[PDB]
Amino acid sequence: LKEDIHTHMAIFEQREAQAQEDVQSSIVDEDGFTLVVGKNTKSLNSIRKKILNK
């Protein structure tokens, strides 16, 4: 169990870290539209879900 948990947390932290950088990296569309990302946002997948939810 110790090894299984340790591997799983490490993989998650890398993916979570990468996701947070992607959203807060000044995303700009090919037509020069700069996506607005709020502070504390971590995943772009979450942003899409809000647009769908609302």
Binding site: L1, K2, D4, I5, H8, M9, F12, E16, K42, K49, N53
Partner: protein, 708 residues
């Protein structure tokens, strides 16, 4: 309520008929108050006329302190003085109509009037059917907690001693020996039991009132023109608070033995003793010994009745004995002597938990522990077998405990990551627990109760005292992730995901509330603890616990107590259990919802707005599910307003089987009275209607490791 105008000094409950009801109408329509003011006005409707008298009988006392006088031929006046017997005097005619009322029956009458007045004032729930369209007199056991049948000796005439005891002095006072013996039995039984009981009724079984014209007096087969009865039955309403008291307190010691002390020593004889207590008081007292098979009352009534009425009488209540034996006897010291109302076994479990409860807090963790909430069955006094040290074959040995740490924003937002963080907590809890406290043993286990949630891991702690505890994390993020789970699911899969959420809250969120309320309410209902196990034991014999969650049985078993109407709150194992079976027999779960106020006896009571909300839920559910295939039992309360939490997922065949056995059980009691043969028939499974039956035998006997 089984009330008639017939004689009651003979023993039958009655004397109060229409005439005593209607005559009391006129007295109150002509006055009735302590100021001779009218209590009933002649313009009152049928409801108002009936209400005041149900109120009148309930609160004004007509037997011991106070009596009412009226004029048939003059305003009726309530006098404070009492004649020590029920009296509604009539000065115009100089007759007391309430002469036929026995002292014992009057309090029973007053109890019914008061408890109906409470339902009459009730506005949340309709009580029309209970007050009027429910017969509580069909079974004595359902109506009365304990029943003892006494066989008098030489029964073609009573023994010379017993006939001598009646004597010349009592013919004038009591015209018939049947009347005299009933008063003798009531006085000694009432005096012997004292505060242990609320009401006592003595009934002459097999008493006839009609005889052929060819004969002068009624003839009983046992009587032989001497005594018009077969046998007497002592029926009791026991008081749970002091029913199992080991000692019967008596008058205090003094220089000169007082009259109360005189009757105290004479009545119990050798059984009486003068004994001192820790407080330093010296009083005359007598001793009893508790037993796991019988109550203290059976011992008192036997000894008291034999000494005073007849040394040759035979007292036997085997029916209550069988139910006590069917309750498992734990493997603890002095188990046989322990009473069925004792919860010492559960308390020792709590103290062991308290020791571990301290160790966990002082331990240092990355997140501070918010609270630890025990939620196991034994913590709410409901486990089928009482906890036993090291008896780990009991399936209820490992008690669920909910641990919740302080709110943090660092929880994984992925649920499989969320739990692997949860397990990482318990892993650390295991490590320092092993180091600092080596006397405690621990191991991990997986849980699959929540469907599809295959990562849950729980720590099972084996305490040095010999008890097991199972620990699982609660997280604030966990709930909303499930709410996130339902939202993203495809429309076809959403009904499946909400079912997963339903069992999650059943185990984690609502489980905490269920134990908190039940533990507190159980104290007031002393006999709830014994009955609920025996009901669960009954379910297990018929193979129903496997589909019935433990909570549903508990909510079913508590209905006769929070809602005892038209009956009284049970104070016996046999009375409480049969009432549960009766309710199931007459419960129409397709059209009638089951909703309870989990409150102590007269806040958190359901008021009208919350009440109406719950039926509105039932109607909406039944609109979509009229046949009830998806859901059968609608059990709701303050804790569960949805009403589907603890009754979801049961197959329809099991639901009908539960009601089927109850009706046949009631029909069995109707056809054949309560006895040893019936009780065994109730508690044994048919196993024939099942299409195929598979027999298993374990390699070793599991009783001794189960604590039985």
């Amino acid at each position: 309520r089984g009330f008639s105008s017939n004689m009651s000094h003979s023993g039958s409950l009655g004397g109060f008929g229409t005439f005593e009801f209607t005559i009391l109408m006129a007295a109150l329509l002509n006055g009735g108050g302590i100021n001779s003011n009218k209590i009933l006005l002649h313009g009152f409707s049928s409801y108002q006329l009936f209400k005041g008298v149900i109120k009148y009988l309930a609160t004004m006392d007509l037997c011991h302190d106070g009596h009412l006088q009226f004029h048939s031929n003059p305003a009726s006046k309530y006098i404070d003085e009492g004649f020590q017997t029920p009296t509604l005097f009539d000065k115009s005619t100089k007759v007391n109509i309430l002469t036929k009322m026995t002292v014992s029956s009057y309090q029973i009458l007053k109890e019914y009037a008061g408890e109906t007045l409470r339902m009459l004032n009730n506005v949340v729930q309709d009580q029309f059917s209970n007050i009027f369209l429910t017969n509580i007199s069909r079974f004595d056991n359902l109506k009365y907690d304990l029943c003892y049948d006494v066989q008098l000796p030489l029964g073609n005439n009573l023994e010379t001693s017993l006939a001598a005891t009646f004597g010349s002095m009592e013919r004038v006072k009591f015209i018939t020996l049947e009347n005299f013996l009933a008063h003798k039995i009531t006085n000694v039984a009432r005096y012997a039991l004292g505060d242990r009981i609320k009401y006592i009724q003595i009934e002459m079984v097999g008493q006839k009132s009609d005889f052929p014209i060819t004969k002068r007096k009624v003839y009983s087969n046992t009587g032989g023109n001497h005594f018009n009865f077969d046998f007497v039955r002592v029926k009791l309403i026991v008081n749970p608070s002091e029913c199992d008291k080991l000692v019967t307190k008596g008058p205090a010691h003094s220089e000169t033995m007082s009259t109360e002390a005189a009757v105290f020593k004479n009545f119990w004889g050798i059984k009486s003793s003068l004994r001192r207590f820790k407080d330093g008081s010296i009083t005359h007292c007598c001793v009893w010994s508790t037993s796991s098979s019988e109550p203290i009352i059976s011992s008192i009534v036997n000894f008291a009745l034999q000494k005073h009425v007849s040394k040759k009488a035979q007292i036997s209540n085997e029916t209550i004995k069988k139910f006590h034996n069917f309750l498992p006897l734990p493997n603890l010291p002095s188990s046989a002597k322990t009473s069925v109302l004792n919860l010492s076994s559960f308390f020792n479990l709590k103290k062991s938990f308290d020791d571990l409860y301290k160790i966990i807090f002082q331990m240092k963790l990355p997140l501070s522990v918010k609270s630890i909430l025990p939620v196991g069955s034994a913590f709410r006094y409901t486990s089928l077998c009482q906890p036993v040290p090291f008896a780990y074959s009991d399936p209820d040995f490992f008690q669920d405990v909910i641990l919740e740490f302080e709110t943090s924003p660092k929880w994984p937002d992925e649920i499989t990551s969320l739990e692997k963080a949860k397990t990482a907590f318990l892993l650390k809890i295991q490590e320092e627990l092993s180091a600092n406290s080596s006397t405690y043993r621990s191991f991990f286990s997986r849980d699959e109760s929540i469907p599809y949630n295959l990562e849950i891991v729980t720590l099972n702690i084996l305490t040095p005292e010999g008890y097991g505890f199972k620990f699982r994390v609660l997280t604030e993020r966990d709930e909303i992730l499930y709410l996130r789970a339902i939202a993203n699911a495809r429309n076809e899969l959403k009904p499946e995901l909400e079912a997963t959420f339903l069992k999650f809250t059943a185990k984690y969120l609502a489980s905490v509330r269920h134990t908190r309320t039940l533990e507190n309410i159980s104290h007031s209902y002393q006999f709830y603890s014994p009955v609920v196990r025996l009901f669960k034991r009954w379910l297990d014999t018929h193979l129903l616990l496997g589909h019935i969650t433990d909570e549903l049985a508990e909510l079913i078993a508590i209905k006769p107590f929070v809602d005892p109407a038209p009956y009284f709150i049970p104070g016996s194992l046999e009375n409480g259990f049969l009432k549960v079976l009766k309710f199931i027999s007459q419960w129409n779960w397709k059209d009638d919802p089951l909703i309870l106020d989990l409150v102590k006896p007269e806040s958190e009571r359901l008021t009208l707005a919350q009440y109406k909300g719950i039926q509105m839920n039932f109607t909406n559910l039944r609109n979509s599910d009229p046949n009830g295939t998806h859901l059968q039992f609608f059990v709701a309360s303050k804790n569960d307003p949805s009403g589907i939490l603890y009754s979801s997922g049961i197959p329809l065949p099991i639901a009908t089987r539960l009601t089927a056995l109850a009706k046949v059980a009631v029909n069995l009691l109707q056809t054949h009275g309560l006895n040893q043969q019936t009780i065994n028939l109730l508690f044994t499974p048919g196993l024939k209607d099942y299409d195929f039956v598979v027999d298993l035998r374990t390699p070793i006997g599991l009783k001794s490791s189960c604590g039985i």
